[PDB]
Amino acid sequence: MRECISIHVGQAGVQIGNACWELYCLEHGIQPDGQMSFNTFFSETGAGKHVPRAVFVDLEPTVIDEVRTGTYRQLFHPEQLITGKEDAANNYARGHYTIGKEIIDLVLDRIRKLADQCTGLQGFLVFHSFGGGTGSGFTSLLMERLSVDYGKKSKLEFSIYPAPQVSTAVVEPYNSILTTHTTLEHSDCAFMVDNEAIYDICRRNLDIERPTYTNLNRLISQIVSSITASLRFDGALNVDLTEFQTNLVPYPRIHFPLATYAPVISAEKAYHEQLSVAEITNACFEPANQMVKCDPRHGKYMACCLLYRGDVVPKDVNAAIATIKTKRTIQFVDWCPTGFKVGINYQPPTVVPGGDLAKVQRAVCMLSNTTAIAEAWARLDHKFDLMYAKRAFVHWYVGEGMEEGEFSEAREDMAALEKDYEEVGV
Amino acid sequence: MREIVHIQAGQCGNQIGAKFWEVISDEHGIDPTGSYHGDSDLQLERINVYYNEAAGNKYVPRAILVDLEPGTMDSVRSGPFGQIFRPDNFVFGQSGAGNNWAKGHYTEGAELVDSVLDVVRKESESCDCLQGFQLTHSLGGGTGSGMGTLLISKIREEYPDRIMNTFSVVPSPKVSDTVVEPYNATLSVHQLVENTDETYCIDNEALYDICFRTLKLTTPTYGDLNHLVSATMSGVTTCLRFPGQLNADLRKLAVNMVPFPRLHFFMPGFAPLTSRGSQQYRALTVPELTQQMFDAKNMMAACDPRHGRYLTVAAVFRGRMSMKEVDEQMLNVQNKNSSYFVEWIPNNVKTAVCDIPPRGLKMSATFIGNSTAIQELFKRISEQFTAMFRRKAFLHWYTGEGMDEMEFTEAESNMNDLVSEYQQYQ
Amino acid sequence: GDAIKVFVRIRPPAEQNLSLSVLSSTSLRLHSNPEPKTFTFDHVADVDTTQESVFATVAKSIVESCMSGYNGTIFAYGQTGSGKTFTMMGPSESFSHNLRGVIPRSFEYLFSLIDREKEGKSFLSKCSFIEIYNEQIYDLLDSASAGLYLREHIKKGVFVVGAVEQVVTSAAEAYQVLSGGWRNRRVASTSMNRESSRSHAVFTITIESMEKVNIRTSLLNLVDLAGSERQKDTHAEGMRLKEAGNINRSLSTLGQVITALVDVGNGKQRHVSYRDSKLTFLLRDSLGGNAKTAIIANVHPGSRSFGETLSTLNFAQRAKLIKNKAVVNEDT
Ligand SMILES: */O=C(/[N][C]([C]([O])C(=O)O[C]1[C][C@@]2([O])[C](OC(=O)C3=[C][C]=[C][C]=[C]3)[C]3[C@]4(OC([C])=O)[C]O[C]4[C][C]([O])[C@@]3([C])C(=O)[C](OC([C])=O)C(=C1[C])C2([C])[C])C1=[C][C]=[C][C]=[C]1)C1=[C][C]=[C][C]=[C]1
Ligand SMILES: Nc1nc2c(ncn2[C@@H]2O[C@H](COP(=O)(O)OP(=O)(O)OP(=O)(O)O)[C@@H](O)[C@H]2O)c(=O)[nH]1
Ligand SMILES: Nc1ncnc2c1ncn2[C@@H]1O[C@H](COP(=O)(O)OP(=O)(O)NP(=O)(O)O)[C@@H](O)[C@H]1O
Ligand SMILES: Nc1nc2c(ncn2[C@@H]2O[C@H](COP(=O)(O)OP(=O)(O)O)[C@@H](O)[C@H]2O)c(=O)[nH]1
Ligand SMILES: [Mg+2]
Ligand SMILES: [Mg+2]
């Protein structure tokens, strides 16, 4: 069958992956042990157990040590959980050059072994961060190696974008740009969020006053589940990972979707509300409900995909899409009139006990490429320029094999990308 | 992994370090007999970072006690936690140091240093993966200044790829404690600039001010001042020894706090800091803690931060709290006081989080500031030194041990260069 | 003051779009597209240029100025395998004799001039040869040496404390010190260069003359720098990679110093971080200080080296802007 592989790299990605695997277990009916198209994400043992078709990497042991003592522990087979010695230290030049070129081979061999289980190896999932030290260079290296090996196979990146205003690390800007330099010419599709938007959504739609990492990760997990379920479950108008590549990559370099998931509704607000299909579609297209700091009015949607779940009717969805097209504010690109893919699954989303969300019969995941995101790119390049002008926090990077012209080349590439986006918009 | 070697040199360094060990032992559930009597598995998970285990569940600090006279270390032994140390880790002479950098660095310290180095080497060989070295010393004496500088140089020569951090008690210009203090301090700093990755700069004046204003302490004991320092030190390395939402390595902290190789002199701070009586008028929010951390009264270096700007700030929070609440609060602080944050660095701060409070608190935080304002401290020492040098005062004690005017001039030139660099990045 | 002298030397590719063209002795064409960039220095020598030609254009003047009491520095800067060592020292057992580089030729020229000057003036010449390996100093004149460090002086000289100073009466005697030391300087094999220099070599000749009494003292620094290296091309790993990290770092601070000086040379405020690296500290006088400095920038033509060649030229162009204030170092 069509079957996949999961990779979670860097602390953030590992955390996300925990939540994702919990969600999967709750959906398909798997215990903490492994007891009971389910095989896209769970290979069977001799009996009883099921093994997550997964890989877990971090150079910090403390992250995966936590995994190894939690409830979700003996679900995993210790072949997968790999650990390093000294962490990446928010330094691309340690994740790619120094400590990366040491344990990457082991991870590759594990991946190969796991593939030798897949008859129909459909592709991969990579979870990381444009902002961690591990997730910025090591991820890139892994992608490169996978390209060298397979090439034809499907590859996805779930990329936690640097939030324009809020930021977390001191050298988030350099790391992200270096990742862009290397990943851009390998990974055919990247699905991106930032934390600021998620926080906003929690405040407004869910009325949550305390924004924390667990609930945020759960939201991302739900999106991941929605993206997958086309492979994991039945439904009229189904979807493949390769179909995303075909649908959401007009030009081979431009491949940076946004994401969004509606409904984002609490226990109370589910009542005093009907939740119709058209309503949900409208909510998905709302400026604020978008999972990144990017006004969709400041550009044009090139290519859009919408993955409806549960009790849904095609005609209703079509009507909703027609209504959206009628709206003159939500602009589209002149040269692509057919900018929608419809995905419908009879499985409705199931939410994890002790979490943010309530039951909803009908939900959507919306994945969109736009000229409007270019503003975020420009902001990032401006940040990079501002701190590269002083050349501050550079003595970390130079020591682990680097060059000054690399940065310039990366900035040139970013400029070219911006120019391409502008051309597309025109 | 990532185990740390601890060194105490000179009287002040040794007494501070005793308290530091006492604090950390309590933190990790280690009683004065070297036995573990804690209640959590998290307490032992990473005990390797500071301790070695012996037969019979005995735990032993990987700590070295160095002194050129016996009395201080004898008092340490007599003390409560003194019997936890392995006796062969006491390295000491009998000939006094006379508050003389020359005696510590050139003559009496040179006689003892090789024996110290051999113990250092054994500890390094006993490490699964050496992270770095932590030193405690005064700046204004002979042992901490001369001997400590010597020791650091030799260790960086032996372990040039490892982290070298010092907690260094510095002079307070309004209340000098020794007559040759400027000489000792300038000679020490001349080598600390080159051979350390980070130095946490404490002056006793600031500690006294903290004790009087916030703790409502009419009568501070040196023990209480040492407790304050110890709390800072513990906080710095919490994320090496424990889990977290977003984690901090020592190297990563350097990674976020050092824009230029030389500028690694930090002002530490702590929160909460109140009396036993002025606590019930308060509640414990992330906002409250941040307010307290950025209060000048909660700084442990001798400067008004408003007499300069923060180049970079690292905050390490302990306890369960919303990441978004934290980030939002720090963004508000940046917005409202943007003039005190150098504009080269978007996201002026780094945040780290440790999912574990220190005993008897729900929440705590440690603050690490790198400010252009600290140039004033260097100025004051340079002027004090310079006046005495103009008259060649006290000089025969040092020239008699082979030191030369040119070396002193070099030290002054280094100091002036430091202040000039801070001026440049004002 | 007097601007530093910058020369660009184009090494021949091994036995073919060049991406580099020689406009004239004064100018070069690089082939970047779509839009061109032109660079002009003091002199550019193409691939055919002989070792003797290089000596005449760059070094002969500095030797003469050294005789007159000025301090003088010549250092080769460029990407790995660009020709720095070949230019400064020469082949290492190749053709060998005519191939010898600037350092041996300078010995020969200097001693001939002093012999000529003899016909109550006297000369005293001492030599030192040291390498900067991983921001550490090693004495090439004695392998036993350890614990070498840099020290500032009233003579404004930054010197290596405890370095062997060998008195040399003739060019031949100097050649022995050079040959022994050259063997000493650390070299390793990378994909880019089998003979790659892993350290920065500093050969120093102290020339003191007494006209009896007036005392003239000149420091002649002949520096063969290590080259910037991309790990992907060099395939440096392990100790080779550690050396590359140090080489790139010290070269980065050299660039930082050169840029800062440009800012200061124009009405501006900047700090030069001379003491960021041992190299920049030792070279402090050579860069903006009391010395006549000539920089030979070595470039490889060839499209593969396009980016690195760009970097070297950009650095050299900035260097040309730096003005030094050189005076005769005299005593009466
Ligand atoms: O320092 C030790 N341990 C701490 C904590 O784990 C802890 O339990 O702290 C106590 C400390 C007490 O004494 C207060 O602090 C002091 O008065 C003090 C004296 C000398 C130097 C520094 C502090 C405490 C206070 O300090 C600390 C460190 O928490 C001072 O401002 C804070 C705010 C606290 O709220 C206050 C005022 C308290 O009143 C609190 O009491 C109650 C009832 O909550 C106390 C603590 C929380 C206190 C009165 C008992 C530690 C910090 C960082 C790293 C590791 C440990 C320590 C360890 C062993 C033995 C003795 C002390
Ligand atoms: N959603 C989410 N994002 C996180 C989490 N932890 C960190 N991030 C984001 O990830 C970035 C920091 O990267 P990390 O993943 O923590 O770093 P790392 O990959 O572990 O690399 P090193 O720690 O440097 O070895 C920032 O943009 C954070 O906002 C988390 O638990 N959830
Ligand atoms: N002008 C030249 N004519 C002939 N051979 C040359 C020339 N320049 C360099 N080479 C050859 O190229 C090889 C040397 O590279 P070299 O010139 O030693 O590089 P380098 O700049 O010292 N490399 P690195 O030490 O890594 O910075 C030698 O064996 C030289 O003979
Ligand atoms: N916090 C603290 N500071 C001290 C202590 N003892 C001395 N100092 C400070 O250390 C400096 C004197 O150096 P000292 O260590 O006594 O000289 P040494 O014994 O030769 O190293 C002065 O600034 C003192 O205020 C102590 O027990 N605790
Ligand atoms: Mg991490
Ligand atoms: Mg060479």
Residue numbers in the entry:
A (entry chain A): 1 to 36, 48 to 437
B (entry chain B): 1 to 44, 47 to 360, 369 to 436
C (entry chain C): 24 to 38, 47 to 125, 128 to 152, 157 to 249, 254 to 373
Quoted from the paper:
Kinesins are a superfamily of microtubule (MT)-based molecular motors that play important roles in cellular functions such as mitosis, cell motility, and intracellular transport. The kinesin motor domain is the MT-binding engine that drives these activities, converting the chemical energy of ATP binding and hydrolysis into mechanical force. Recently, it has been demonstrated that a subset of kinesin superfamily members, including kinesin-2s, −3 s, −8 s, and −12 s, are sequestered by kinesin-binding protein (KBP; KIF1BP; KIAA1279), which inhibits MT track attachment by their motor domains and, thus, blocks their MT-related functions. Here we present cryo-electron microscopy (cryo-EM) structures of KBP alone and of KBP bound to the motor domain of the human mitotic kinesin KIF15 (a 110 kDa complex).
To elucidate the mechanism of kinesin inhibition by KBP, we determined the structure of KBP in complex with the human KIF15 (kinesin-12) motor domain (KIF15_MD, 1–375). This construct, which has six of its eight cysteine residues mutated to serine (C5S, C50S, C162S, C294S, C314S, and C346S) and two additional cysteines were inserted (S250C and G375C), has comparable steady-state ATPase activity to previously published reports and we refer to it as KIF15_MD6S. We determined the structure of the MT-bound, AMPPNP state of KIF15_MD6S, which shows that this MD adopts a canonical conformation. MT binding stabilises the tubulin-binding subdomain of the MD while the P-loop and Switch 1/2 subdomains – which contain the conserved nucleotide-coordinating P-loop and Switch 1 and 2 motifs – move relative to each other in response to the nucleotide state of the MD. The KBP-bound conformation of the KIF15_MD6S tubulin-binding subdomain is also radically different from its MT-bound conformation. The tubulin-binding subdomain forms the majority of the MT-binding surface in the KIF15_MD6S-MT complex such that KBP and MTs cannot simultaneously bind KIF15_MD6S due to extensive steric overlap. Our evidence suggests this observation is not due to use of a cysteine-substituted KIF15 motor domain construct because: (i) this protein exhibited equivalent MT-stimulated ATPase activity compared to non-substituted KIF15_MD, (ii) it exhibited structurally canonical MT binding and response to nucleotide, and (iii) the substituted residues are not well conserved among KBP-binding kinesins. The interaction of kinesin motor domains with the MT surface via its tubulin-binding subdomain stimulates nucleotide exchange and kinesin ATPase activity.
